[PDB]
Amino acid sequence: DLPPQLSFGLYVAAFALGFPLNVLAIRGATAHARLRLTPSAVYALNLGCSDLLLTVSLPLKAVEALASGAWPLPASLCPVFAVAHFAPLYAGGGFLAALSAARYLGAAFPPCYSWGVCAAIWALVLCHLGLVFGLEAPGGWLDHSNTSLGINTPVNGSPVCLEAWDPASAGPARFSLSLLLFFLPLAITAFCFVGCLRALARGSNIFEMLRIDEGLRLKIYKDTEGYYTIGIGHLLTKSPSLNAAKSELDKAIGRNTNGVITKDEAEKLFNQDVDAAVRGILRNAKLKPVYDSLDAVRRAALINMVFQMGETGVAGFTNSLRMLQQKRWDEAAVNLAKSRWYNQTPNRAKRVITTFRTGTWDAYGSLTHRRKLRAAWVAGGALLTLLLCVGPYNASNVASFLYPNLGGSWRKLGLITGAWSVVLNPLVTGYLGRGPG
Ligand SMILES: Cc1cc(OCCCS(C)(=O)=O)cc(C)c1-c1cccc(COc2cc3c(cn2)[C@H]2[C@@H](C3)[C@@H]2C(=O)O)c1
Numbered sequence: 001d002l003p004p005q006l007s008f009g010l011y012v013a014a015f016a017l018g019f020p021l022n023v024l025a026i027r028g029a030t031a032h033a034r035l036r037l038t039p040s041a042v043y044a045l046n047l048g049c050s051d052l053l054l055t056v057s058l059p060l061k062a063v064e065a066l067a068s069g070a071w072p073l074p075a076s077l078c079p080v081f082a083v084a085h086f087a088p089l090y091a092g093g094g095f096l097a098a099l100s101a102a103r104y105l106g107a108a109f110p111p112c113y114s115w116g117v118c119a120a121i122w123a124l125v126l127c128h129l130g131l132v133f134g135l136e137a138p139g140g141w142l143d144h145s146n147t148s149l150g151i152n153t154p155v156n157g158s159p160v161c162l163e164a165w166d167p168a169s170a171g172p173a174r175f176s177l178s179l180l181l182f183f184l185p186l187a188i189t190a191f192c193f194v195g196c197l198r199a200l201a202r203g204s205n206i207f208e209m210l211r212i213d214e215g216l217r218l219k220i221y222k223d224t225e226g227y228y229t230i231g232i233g234h235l236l237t238k239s240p241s242l243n244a245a246k247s248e249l250d251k252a253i254g255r256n257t258n259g260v261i262t263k264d265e266a267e268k269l270f271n272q273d274v275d276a277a278v279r280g281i282l283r284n285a286k287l288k289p290v291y292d293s294l295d296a297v298r299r300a301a302l303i304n305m306v307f308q309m310g311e312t313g314v315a316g317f318t319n320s321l322r323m324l325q326q327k328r329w330d331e332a333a334v335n336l337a338k339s340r341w342y343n344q345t346p347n348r349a350k351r352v353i354t355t356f357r358t359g360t361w362d363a364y365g366s367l368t369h370r371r372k373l374r375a376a377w378v379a380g381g382a383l384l385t386l387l388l389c390v391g392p393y394n395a396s397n398v399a400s401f402l403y404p405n406l407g408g409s410w411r412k413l414g415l416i417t418g419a420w421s422v423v424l425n426p427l428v429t430g431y432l433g434r435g436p437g
Pocket residue numbers: 079080082083086087126129130131132133134149162170173174
């Protein structure tokens with residue numbers, strides 16, 4: 001038993017904060033929907049509108065809490081409060097799962113359909129709640145007595161909106177909807193979160209990593225050390241002669257290039273350069289065992305080093321190589337940080353070293369990688385709000401259906417945590433401020 005003033009206060013704090021936050025989330029999602037319609041924006045707009053509807057019902061639940069559960073408002077307001085409070089409480093979980101799945105699929109695999117999915121979520125929640133209420137609520141179709149719709153009167157002078165509803169009728173309705181709109185979306189969200197984590201881990205490679213580090217030039221240029229270079233970090237020669245560089249360029253492409261090439265030629269030269277670096281590792285006694293023991297992402301950081309310095313230059317880092325085979329990531333990093341390579345190209349070296357430390361693509365913050373990070377944050381954030389806010393409410397529905405001998409204190413706590421989804425949802429969906437751009 002929570003004191004009425006504490007219950008009133010908790011509902012008022014969720015309402016006072018939820019009203020501006022959801023007004024800001026709707027604004028953010030509407031802007032994105034108008035500029036470039038995306039499934040994520042549609043799901044975020046529906047969740048924003050839903051949470052705002054739940055927000056506006058919170059003062060009514062606050063005064064009910066202050067009246068110790070009695071309905072201190074006109075009886076005709078009970079059906080309106082019923083739909084404004086409970087339809088968003090169940091629909092929200094559906095929109096969070098939809099949003100999490102749209103974010104995961106959009107990022108791991110880089111409009112009209114999303115509106116259909118939202119209409120289906122709203123149709124199910126409104127028909128499920130509507131049919132049970134219209135038919136089985138006190139004052140409903142099956143009720144023959146002079147009773148206001150949704151109102152029970154356990155004692156004289158004490159009308160109760162919904163909370164005194166016969167459990168034999170409300171219980172199976174709450175339980176079935178909790179399975180479909182909370183537990184299934186919870187599994188979907190948990191699946192998308194894991195999928196996002198896995199997509200970050202195996203979604204990039206050496207080719208993409210070297211493109212960021214090397215860049216692209218269609219004409220012969222002098223690199224950082226002054227050597228004639230072309231394409232994607234392809235060293236033509238160390239010789240102080242442009243004619244020698246053009247001569248080497250012509251033999252590599254098999255055409256009279258005159259120091260200028262095509263993107264396809266530069267790409268084909270880059271592929272030959274990566275295979276050469278891979279060949280150099282496998283033919284080296286100190287490199288091959290290290291490479292074989294390494295995961296896919298760390299193998300790429302090893303190829304990146306060989307591509308930049310050559311097999312021999314890399315084989316000289318005997319302490320770091322031993323450390324890497326021993327899986328002593330921080331000790332290898334500390335050794336590589338004292339190298340001439342780090343002194344000469346610190347930005348490039350820090351990125352490769354961080355890749356050896358973490359085994360992730362985090363140092364290579366490309367558009368694709370950032371989109372995947374964003375997707376993981378939304379799905380992780382959705383999982384947290386599902387478990388903390390509406391989660392205790394849906395677990396209470398399941399607990400009471402299986403063990404109806406439980407008292408009503410758990411449901412009372414779950415309804416308060418459910419109300420706080422109006423605060424946590426706009427904070428996790430990412431449409432506040434500048435947006436998820
Ligand atoms: C069916 C209906 C009839 C109505 O008015 C018709 C009677 C008007 S009259 C008397 O002038 O003829 C008004 C509404 C909003 C509705 C209506 C439509 C859609 C949804 C709802 C709200 O339904 C529900 C159902 C449940 C709850 C809350 N609202 C509680 C239970 C189960 C859920 C829970 O505890 O999780 C209600």
